[PDB]
RNA sequence: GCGCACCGCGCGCAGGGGGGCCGGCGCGGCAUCUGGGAAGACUCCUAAGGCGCAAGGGAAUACCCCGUGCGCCGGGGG
């Protein structure tokens, strides 16, 4: 039981760190240079931009 | 490749929320000497891209 | 030569192509040699695309053996410009990662791709 | 605390929150791959307090196959101090190491490896042990090292092949005795990945048996790997 | 009771041909459940189940000598190289294997590719060349392969079942010409005639109703017979066009066979009306003959 | 009844069904020449001498279990020997590598197996030549 | 990112260790 | 449908894209002097074909499909010359073709542009798709890179000058190409040209006047000078 | 096969080996049909406006709301 729940904890804290740094990529798309896809905004409509970098 | 030599700077840097080191071991090349400047950091990634290939 | 796992151009190079141009734009995607190892060494990556038409193949024949290590497949497409703009980069793009979260369609579609990827290793 | 497992020269390792399944070390003070082990003195030194000559390495069932097995239940290994054991499959010599830690000093482990790195450092860890030879040959052609191995009691198979029971076959057919030990680990993702994992073992079963061999048990991995299967069979007997 | 398999020995002095066919039961019978059948020359016959075993047939003996199996599934086609020997055998999983014919044995020798889709059946396969492979697929294409590689040459597609329901052309028979060009029998009841060179079609000939299970060319490139889901033959002549059609059967054509040998060049088909039933090639010559 | 079996001791002859000669070589670079020899079944005086014969030629018949030895050592004139190959039987190849410890007394009762290792390196590190790096 | 990065390398190897322990426990 | 079709310069024969794909695309080609279907031009792919385009001559077919597939088809053979596929396309939308003294065995006209979902437009010269043995991989004479977005109109001046292409996703998204020197101008157009959304261009039948049709419908005429 | 009626059947139960292979459940394909998602860039892209980041103010104080600095796209005109 001791290490079923260290296994459940580090699992827990891996899987937060995992969505927080998916997060964080989100937000390199959102706040980039140029339009580029990707993220979700708070209407619940998902950012695709259908364009190519040039 | 770029950052051979720096670790403990880089990974005080990484887990203080600060300025990541430029260059490691590569700044005593032929190269990175040779340029000054902003040049010494921009060499720095190509040469490193250049030589890890 | 050393592409042992190479793509069938009828429709399974198409399919892995998408795939990426979908991933790309979920930004799930992990673009050129460098950023892909970095995605298979990190243990991030849920599949790795290289390119054949490199023209030292040398260069992204790394990458093979961290992926042996990390247990991913990996395989071939044999042009680094059908690559390149798959991902959309107007660059060629030499070996593509793509990786994957808890709950996407793009989840499954990498699960069926390397489906078929493991038909072929 | 260390005390003998059921089978000849493998040991278990009882601690207060755990266990540890390990061997003995044959070249004592030297970890091979960077693992755990134990190190204890004959008794009478209790004044002395200090470790010198008995060694065991840590043996690992998610780096090992045979491990898998031997926690897996295995009935039989084959292998004990004193047999000539045929390993398939040799990368880097790890299992390799804890075979040649079975089979001891008088034993003698035929490593074959067809990759030249792993040739490599398959060459450093049998230039540290004596019992082990390094071959670095194709497995599919036999006849390049039957210059080098003897009749051998047990052939140990871990080859990721299609064609793993024609490798085993040939093999068995020039180098292994009358009535033989074969222990085979099988990936049924990779003899037949889009088939189900039973009739693939059950399949690989039925080409050793039509190659005459004959299955002793089965018994699958699975707590320590996926989809692989131990096989342990008897050569014309 | 029904015909699955026919094969001549020979197609083309006292040499001894004879013919093979294969009854519904599980049958062999030879004249002067199986589902296919071949023989081999360099003279042996090999058939196929439904299961995954390829057997010979030892015929001075009549009994089942020399089986061969594998891990894959079930055997839908099978076939012998041309010379300028192995077999070719293709299945449900979209696995095509190789069984190797060394001197005498039958081996499970090597399985080459295989298709990403494994909704691909394969359904029956003919050698363009050598070296080279023409398989149908149950999805609607036809697909070239090389051996000495492996390698997945072009998929020649067909297009969607026009003519109602489904969506699928199901390929049914394929052939080849001593010209270099292949002949498909797909399903709802077209032929095609693709190119060889560039691995394209080139003509599109709709004649049956209903899908044309089995055909057969000429030993000189003239005459193609195909043979329907419905109770229809037809005759075939310079690409090219019919010339007329007999339902000399009275259930469906399930597999033909032609000879060009001895003064004697006939073509035998069988269907599930239980009566094997042989033609002429010279189709404006006489008339035909049954057996049972 | 000619043969030729070759073990990791040297060559042999059993003429006569019992072991009746041998051809001993040991410890050299020549030593895994021998391999080099046998790379294709080339010509060697151990192998040559121990099939050398002087009365006549009245039985020409030998069973080695590769082809690729016995065709190789077809073309040597050195006996005008042209042997053929061993008919897939390996009741004797397989009785005799189990029967090489009522061998060594013939030939050499020692361990041969310390320099069939080095033999393992000059084959193996050979190989390791052969990737020169 | 940099600092989340290399939270999860750390995070990720203690998790690989001790769910290797774990299975050696049971 | 009947809506994609092309006519050829000779004015012969008239193809129109058959509408049913299930992994491939035809063509089926009209007789107009009786309006009878005479031939067909199936090629394999994805979803069929994109865009073709008649030979000059009239002799045959040039067809874009969606995988990067592109069929050279004969009309007097009635059978594929050969298939080559582009540089990297993805999907691959449009296809145009024009210009003088190219193969006489593939119409004689000397220039082709092939544009993808990517925004990139590939010109290919058709002499160099011999090496009848037709070249599977050739490269393109100019990769054209500046348009980000799906290309959705190509064209050539029938003098086999100028190259107008453009995208109707972006607003001015129309670019004009010197052949054979293959060099995008970069005077027209500028911030203040108006186009539109553009959703069709037009060449006159002396080259010199262009016509730009946009999202909006509103045509815009442009004389060209040379 | 033991105990219960040695003026009886059957019963409480230990469980061998196969059967009717009846139905459910599990796993595998399944030409189609049905639903959902993804989806072609002609399509759909919420409107002539929207989105993001960072600050500011207010709360149903988990959510949410309002209009300053930086940017990203868009409509119109051109």
Redesign the pocket.
């Known amino acids: 039981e001791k290490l079923a729940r260290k296994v459940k904890a580090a699992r827990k804290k891996l899987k937060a760190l995992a969505d927080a740094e998916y997060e964080l990529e989100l937000?390199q798309a959102?706040?980039?240079?140029?339009?580029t896809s990707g993220g979700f905004?708070?209407?619940g409509?998902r950012?695709?931009v259908?364009?190519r970098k040039r | 490749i770029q950052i051979l030599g720096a670790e403990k700077a880089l990974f005080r840097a990484l887990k203080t929320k600060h300025a990541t080191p430029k260059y490691g071991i590569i700044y005593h090349a032929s190269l990175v000497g040779q340029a000054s400047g902003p040049n010494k950091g921009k060499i720095a990634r190509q040469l490193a891209a250049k030589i890890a290939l | 030569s050393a592409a042992w796992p190479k793509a069938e151009d009828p429709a399974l190079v198409q399919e892995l192509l998408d795939c990426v141009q979908?991933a790309s734009?979920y930004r799930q995607l992990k673009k050129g040699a460098n950023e892909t190892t970095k995605s298979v060494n990190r243990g991030t990556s849920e599949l790795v695309i290289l390119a054949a038409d490199t023209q030292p193949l040398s260069i992204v024949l790394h990458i093979p053996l961290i992926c042996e290590e990390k247990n991913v497949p990996y395989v071939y497409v044999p042009s680094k410009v059908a690559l390149g703009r798959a991902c959309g980069v107007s660059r060629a793009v030499i070996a593509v990662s793509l990786t994957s979260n808890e709950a996407s369609?793009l989840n499954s579609k990498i699960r069926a791709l390397r489906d078929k990827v493991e038909r072929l290793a | 605390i260390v005390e003998p497992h059921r089978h000849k020269g493998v040991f278990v390792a009882r601690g207060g929150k755990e266990d540890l399944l390990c061997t003995a070390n044959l070249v004592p003070g030297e970890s091979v791959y960077g693992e755990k082990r134990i190190s204890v003195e004959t008794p009478g030194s209790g004044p002395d307090a200090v470790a010198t000559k008995t060694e065991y390495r840590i043996w690992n069932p998610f780096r090992s196959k045979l491990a898998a097995g031997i926690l897996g239940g295995l009935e039989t290994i084959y292998m004990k101090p004193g047999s000539k054991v045929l390993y398939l499959g040799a990368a880097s010599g790890t299992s390799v190491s804890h075979v040649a830690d079975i089979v001891g000093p008088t034993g003698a482990v035929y490593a074959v490896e067809f990759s030249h790195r792993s040739g490599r450092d398959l060459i450093n860890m049998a230039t540290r042990r004596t019992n082990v030879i390094p071959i670095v040959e194709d497995a599919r052609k036999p006849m390049a090292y039957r210059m080098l191995v003897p009749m051998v009691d047990v052939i140990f198979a871990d080859v990721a092949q299609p064609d793993q029971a024609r490798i085993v076959g040939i093999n068995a057919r020039l180098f292994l005795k009358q009535g033989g030990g074969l222990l085979i680990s099988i990936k049924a993702s990779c003899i037949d990945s889009t088939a189900?994992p039973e009739q693939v073992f059950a399949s690989e079963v039925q080409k050793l048996r039509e190659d005459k061999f004959f299955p002793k048990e089965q018994l699958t991995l699975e707590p320590y790997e996926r989809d692989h299967a131990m096989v342990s069979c008897v050569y014309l007997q | 009771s029904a015909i699955n398999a026919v094969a001549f020995t020979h197609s083309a002095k006292n040499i001894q041909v004879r013919l093979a066919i294969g009854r519904a039961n599980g049958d062999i019978e030879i004249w002067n459940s199986v589902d296919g059948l071949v023989w081999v020359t360099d003279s042996r016959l090999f058939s196929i189940g439904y299961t995954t075993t390829i057997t010979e047939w030892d015929l001075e003996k009549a009994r089942a000598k020399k089986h061969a199996s594998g891990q894959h599934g079930e055997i839908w086609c099978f076939g012998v190289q041309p010379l300028p020997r192995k077999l070719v055998a293709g299945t449900?999983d979209g696995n095509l294997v190789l069984y190797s014919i060394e001197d005498g044995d039958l081996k499970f020798q090597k399985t080459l590719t295989r298709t990403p889709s494994?909704?691909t059946?394969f359904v029956s396969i003919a050698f363009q060349s050598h070296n080279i492979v023409i398989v149908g697929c149950?999805n609607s294409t036809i697909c070239a392969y090389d051996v000495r590689t492996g390698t997945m040459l072009r998929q020649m597609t067909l297009g969607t079942?026009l003519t109602g329901?489904?969506?699928?052309i199901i390929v049914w028979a394929v052939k080849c010409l001593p010209n270099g060009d292949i002949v498909s029998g797909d399903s709802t009841g077209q032929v095609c005639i693709w190119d060889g060179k560039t691995y394209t079609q080139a003509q599109r000939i709709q004649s049956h109703t209903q899908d044309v299970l089995c055909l057969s060319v000429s030993a000189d490139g003239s005459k193609i017979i195909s043979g329907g889901m419905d109770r229809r033959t037809a005759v075939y002549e310079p690409r090219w066009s019919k010339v007329f059609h007999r339902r000399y059967h009275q259930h469906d054509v399930k597999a033909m066979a032609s000879f060009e040998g001895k003064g004697m060049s006939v073509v035998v088909s069988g269907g599930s009306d239980a009566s094997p039933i042989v033609l002429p090639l010279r189709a404006l010559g006489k008339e035909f003959h049954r057996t049972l | 009844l000619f043969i030729l079996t070759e073990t990791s001791a040297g060559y042999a002859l059993f003429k006569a069904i019992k072991y009746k000669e041998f051809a001993k070589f040991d410890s050299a670079a020549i030593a895994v020449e021998e391999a080099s020899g046998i790379l294709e079944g080339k010509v060697t005086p151990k192998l040559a001498s121990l099939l050398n014969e002087l009365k006549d030629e009245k039985k020409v018949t030998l069973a080695v279990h590769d082809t690729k030895l016995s065709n190789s050592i077809t073309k040597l004139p050195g006996i005008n020997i042209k042997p053929i190959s061993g008919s897939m039987t390996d009741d004797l190849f397989r009785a005799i590598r189990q029967h090489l410890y009522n061998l060594i007394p013939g030939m050499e009762p020692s361990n041969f197996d310390e320099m069939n290792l080095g033999l393992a390196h000059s084959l193996s590190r050979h190989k390791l030549k052969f990737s020169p790096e | 990112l940099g600092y989340v990065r290399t939270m999860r390398n750390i995070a990720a190897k203690e998790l690989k260790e001790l769910e290797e322990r774990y299975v050696l426990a049971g | 449908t009947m809506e994609r079709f092309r006519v050829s310069p000779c004015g012969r024969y008239m193809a129109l894209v058959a509408s049913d794909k299930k992994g491939g695309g035809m063509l089926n080609i009209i007789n107009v002097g009786t309006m009878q279907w005479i031939a067909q031009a199936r090629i394999d792919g994805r979803?069929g074909v994109?865009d073709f385009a008649w030979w000059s001559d009239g002799n045959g077919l040039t067809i874009a499909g969606?995988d990067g597939q592109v069929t050279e088809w004969s009309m007097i053979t009635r059978r594929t010359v050969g298939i080559w596929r582009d540089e990297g396309s993805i999907?691959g939308?449009v296809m145009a073709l024009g210009g003088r003294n190219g193969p006489a065995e593939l119409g004689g006209d000397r220039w082709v542009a092939i544009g993808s979902?990517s925004g990139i437009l590939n010109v290919y010269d058709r002499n160099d798709l011999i090496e009848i043995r037709i070249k599977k991989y050739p490269t393109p004479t100019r990769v054209f890179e500046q348009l980000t977005?799906?290309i959705?109109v190509v064209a050539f001046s029938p003098d086999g000058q100028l190259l107008a292409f453009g995208?109707?996703?972006?607003?001015?998204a129309l670019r004009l190409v010197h052949l054979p020197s293959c060099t995008v101008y970069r005077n027209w157009p500028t911030?203040?040209?108006?186009?539109?959304?553009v959703t069709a261009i037009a060449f006159s039948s002396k080259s010199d006047v262009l016509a730009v049709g946009n999202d909006?419908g509103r045509v815009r005429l442009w004389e060209i000078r040379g």
Request: no cysteine; glycine share 6%.
């Open positions: 937000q959102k706040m980039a240079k140029t339009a905004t708070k209407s409509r950012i695709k259908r364009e | 979908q734009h369609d | 189900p | 449900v494994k909704k059946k149950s079942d329901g489904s969506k699928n | 979803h994109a969606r999907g939308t979902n977005t799906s959705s995208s109707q996703h972006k607003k001015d911030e203040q040209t108006p186009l539109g959304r909006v």
